Assembly symmetry: C2
Homo-oligomer: 155 residues x 2
């Protein structure tokens, strides 16, 4: 199943019949972001989908003007800083506000963040601590949520 | 001011008149733990005291049988794991349940945890990621809270 538009944002997912049981739809899940695909063949789609439905961005704004306007490289480093603060930071509560990776994707090491500005939005993504190779794609605001919501409706 | 018993657990704190303003008591704070002292001369006592009053252990139990009975070295590593999970852990929410350092202390790098068992309790402490030189002192259960509560009463 494929919801959204791979040139901007889409989710592609399917169970593999031979990996699965009536309880566990096990198979593949990927995000297309500005034409690029990051994917995992390690997903249990019920668990991934129920967790996408409870991302902070589904019911709250994730406005951040700085992160929108700075480099993809710097933003991804700052977002990974917020999510995984070190002991230099003191005793700081971690921040997953902007994180929108499905669990299968996070668990492989794809960290994918949503930042909104006014009427636009950015997915900012990279692999692990490789901030140099980070990237992003400009979306319309609400586009990510609406694609997610579509995936949940169609299942 | 000094509340508790340095041979088990005490808090020692005072404003420094020259660092302070009528609005802010700025000065020193230390924890004595089994006769050992860890201290900071960079504490704002209002902020430290109000944050001690809201530690998870003031309202909730922090029973943990494993952490009580294992090595100080291993327990401190496991507690620092929970508090500062890495990207290996996936996208996991940090855990400060057991942390009881005042902020001035955690900001310098003293991480001090409370673990309860039955009728007893342990402060488990170390500096930064130095799990080898960790240590602990056995307290009576409720002793830590009671000293904290005493510091708040006397201010």
């Amino acid at each position: 199943m494929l919801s959204g538009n791979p040139h901007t944002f889409a989710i592609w997912c399917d169970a593999v019949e031979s990996w699965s049981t009536p309880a566990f739809a096990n198979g593949c899940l990927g995000y297309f972001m500005g034409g690029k695909l990051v994917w995992s063949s390690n997903s249990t789609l019920g668990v991934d989908l129920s967790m996408l439905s409870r991302l902070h961005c589904m019911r709250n704004t994730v406005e951040d003007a700085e992160l929108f306007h700075i480099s993809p490289e710097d933003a991804y480093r700052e977002l990974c800083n917020r999510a995984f603060p070190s002991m230099d930071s003191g005793a700081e509560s971690n921040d997953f506000t902007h994180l929108v990776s499905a669990e299968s994707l996070s668990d492989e090491g794809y960290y994918i963040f949503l930042v909104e500005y006014d009427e636009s939005a950015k997915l900012i993504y990279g692999f692990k601590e490789n901030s140099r190779e980070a990237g992003e794609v400009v979306l319309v605001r609400g586009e990510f949520q609406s694609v997610v919501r579509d995936v949940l409706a169609k299942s």
